[PDB]
């Protein structure tokens, strides 16, 4: 199957309460393997998966230096973007950045990406070709002109389709005993009366990895898009994920409903039905 390496960065200004909070997290697929937190004690990049701890001191020195350099640029950009958006020095604001790359099961490069946000909304993104940028508004276009003139895309591309791929391949080999697993979902249905005449049917998926999954409710084959309650996929805390989807049905009509489960780890899509006697 395919794999990804992604780094997530959040910088939050804290006017009058010190320098901005900076948190960086690195993932391979849905497994976190490094972190940096400006409010933590070490002020180092730190391991968060067993298979990265074998990296040597020169690895952690370089990761610490480069991730702190990202935090410095983000602190500068918080002030720059305050100016572009004509905001006061008093408020707290947020920059978020995600970048990374995908490889196929044979290790070939599939795609690279970088997306930036300001106060929770799109700011600027690298396009699929890794050659051009899309700014979200007229303020972000100022950044785009700067990055065009400085040939930032070419510099970033050499990382996204070069360095990123090389190290993702190394990590997949170093963590192969645990990153190549796909745990398919363990599924079941529950049933909860809400009155004498109605009940909730809840379709469960448990213990699956990766986190990507689809749960869908059909009535007589017709989808129930608007009457379905769907919760966000959530971590179990042991490396797997959980999700459920629910529908309120008339008592006695349970057998007219089916829940359909799709997961890359499932030989065939699962269909679940309440087993009324």
């Amino acid at each position: 199957g395919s794999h990804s390496m992604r780094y997530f960065f959040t910088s939050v200004s804290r006017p009058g309460r010190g320098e901005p909070r900076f948190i960086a997290v690195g993932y391979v697929d849905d497994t976190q393997f490094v972190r940096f937190d400006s409010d933590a004690a070490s002020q180092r990049m730190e391991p968060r998966a067993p298979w990265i701890e074998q990296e040597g001191p020169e690895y952690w020195d370089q990761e610490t230096r480069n991730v702190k350099a990202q935090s410095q640029t983000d602190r500068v950009d918080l002030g720059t973007l305050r100016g572009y958006y004509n905001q006061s020095e008093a408020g707290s604001h947020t920059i978020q950045i995600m970048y990374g790359c995908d490889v196929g099961s044979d290790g070939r490069f599939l795609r690279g990406y970088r997306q930036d946000a300001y106060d929770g909304k799109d700011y600027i993104a690298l396009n699929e070709d890794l050659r051009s940028w899309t700014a979200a508004d007229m303020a972000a276009q100022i950044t785009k002109r700067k990055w065009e003139a400085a040939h930032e895309a070419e510099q970033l591309r050499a990382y996204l389709d070069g360095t990123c791929v090389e190290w993702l391949r190394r990590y997949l080999e170093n963590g192969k005993e645990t990153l190549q697993r796909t745990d398919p979902p363990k599924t079941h249905m529950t049933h909860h009366p809400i009155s004498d005449h109605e009940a909730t049917l809840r379709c469960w998926a448990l213990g699956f990895y990766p986190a990507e999954i689809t749960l869908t409710w059909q009535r007589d084959g017709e989808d129930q898009t608007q009457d379905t309650e769907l919760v966000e996929t959530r971590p179990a805390g042991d490396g797997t994920f959980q999700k459920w989807a629910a529908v309120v049905v008339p008592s006695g009509e349970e057998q007219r409903y089916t829940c359909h489960v799709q997961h890359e780890g499932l030989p065939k899509p699962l269909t679940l039905r309440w087993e009324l006697s």
Binding site: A24, R65, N66, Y99, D116, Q155
Partner: peptide, 10 residues
């Protein structure tokens, strides 16, 4: 590994 230091500001 993260990208190397030196990218320009916004």
């Amino acid at each position: 590994v993260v990208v190397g230091a030196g990218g320009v500001g916004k």
